[PDB]
């Protein structure tokens, strides 16, 4: 074991990520950045960061009745704000900007000519 | 498959939002011109 | 694969599309009004 009580159960039916502390203890306190982030809620031994795609980033600890679990660091890249910079996408975006600036330039040309 | 749909969908979100910014600045300048006329 | 977030992205795209159509209509109507 080596005091690595923190485990994760993933690939659930519903999109989420749950971290399991290998302790059946009262007031199992999870710590963040060297300080406790919250004491254990009643009758539930697992801390749930939430849905999978939130991309949690940080350093997390665990302490039950015994000494602290050796902390597990989790990096997550369920990237949501991702696009591909392939030839088609860049070409379409640049075509779109060209036509947009063209029409607004025609409009301002008309406005300045008539005014 | 569906991931590519997400990529193109969010790209459309960003760049049509950018088009909307272009539209609102155009609205601002034409509003200034019309208010000067009126 | 989860369809929940991409569907909301599609809904936002369509909302932005009706936004863009309305804004283009506003711009063209005001351009016509400025002409007349």
């Amino acid at each position: 074991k080596g005091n690595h009580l923190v485990k994760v159960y993933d690939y659930q039916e519903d999109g989420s990520v749950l971290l399991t502390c290998d302790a059946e203890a009262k007031n199992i306190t999870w710590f963040k950045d060297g300080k406790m982030i919250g004491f254990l809620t009643e009758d539930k031994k697992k801390w749930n960061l939430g849905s999978n795609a939130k991309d949690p980033r940080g350093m997390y600890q665990c302490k039950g009745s015994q000494n602290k679990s050796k902390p597990l660091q989790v990096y997550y890249r369920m990237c949501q704000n991702c696009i591909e910079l392939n030839a088609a996408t860049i070409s379409g975006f640049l075509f779109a900007e060209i036509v947009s600036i063209f029409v607004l330039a025609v409009g301002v040309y008309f406005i300045a000519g008539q005014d | 498959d569906t991931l590519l749909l997400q990529l193109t969908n969010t790209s459309a979100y960003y760049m049509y939002l950018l088009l909307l910014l272009k539209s609102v600045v155009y609205f601002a300048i034409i509003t200034c011109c019309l208010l000067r006329r009126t | 694969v989860h369809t929940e977030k991409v569907n909301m992205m599609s809904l936002t795209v369509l909302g932005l599309r009706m936004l863009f159509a309305k804004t283009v209509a506003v711009n063209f109507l005001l351009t016509a009004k400025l002409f007349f």
Binding site: - | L5, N9 | R17
Partner: peptide
């Protein structure tokens, strides 16, 4: 693929509609 077709068709129809409305305003003059 298909959404990309939607955006290209959107671009061309916006151009066509703007041109048509401007030219209709010109002819109605």
């Amino acid at each position: 693929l298909d959404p990309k077709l939607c955006y290209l068709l959107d671009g061309i129809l916006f151009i066509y509609g703007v041109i048509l409305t401007a030219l209709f305003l010109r002819v109605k003059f």
